Design a protein around this ligand. Structure first.
Ligand SMILES: [Mg+2]
Length: 121
């Protein structure tokens, strides 16, 4: 019924935008956030969330490499990329890192829900 979401993005305004988008839904409860891949890896282990919204270019560590590490420890958590980069290769790298979804910025509110709802019917 409820899916514990965790938002990670180097842009703090971006984190707020998605956090507000998930507020109208009953289902997506935001449980934490991070601005870099390394903090995301530590928060993912501690928190043990059902869903991650991940940004690819971040200052501390790449978001794709963070995705691989997170899935290595816990495969069950579903990780969705949400990024300004839409290169075909990049998507290839993301799915090879264990990603379950790809969101291309710029987007609208409805797309975030319909993509998230694909993995959580
Ligand atoms: Mg970024």
């Amino acid at each position: 019924s409820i899916v514990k979401t965790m938002i990670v993005d180097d842009s703090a305004f971006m984190r707020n935008i998605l956090k507000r988008i998930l507020s109208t839904t009953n289902k997506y409860v935001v449980i934490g956030e991070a601005a870099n891949g390394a903090d995301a890896i530590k928060m993912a282990e501690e928190l043990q969330p059902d869903l991650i919204s991940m940004d690819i270019v971040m200052p501390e560590t790449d978001g794709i490499t963070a995705t691989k590490a997170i899935k290595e420890k816990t495969p069950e958590i579903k990780i969705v990329m949400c990024t300004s980069v839409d290169q075909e290769q990049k998507m290839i790298d993301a799915v090879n890192a264990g990603a379950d979804g790809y969101i291309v910025k710029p987007f609208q509110a409805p797309k975030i829900l319909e993509q998230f709802n694909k993995l959580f019917p």
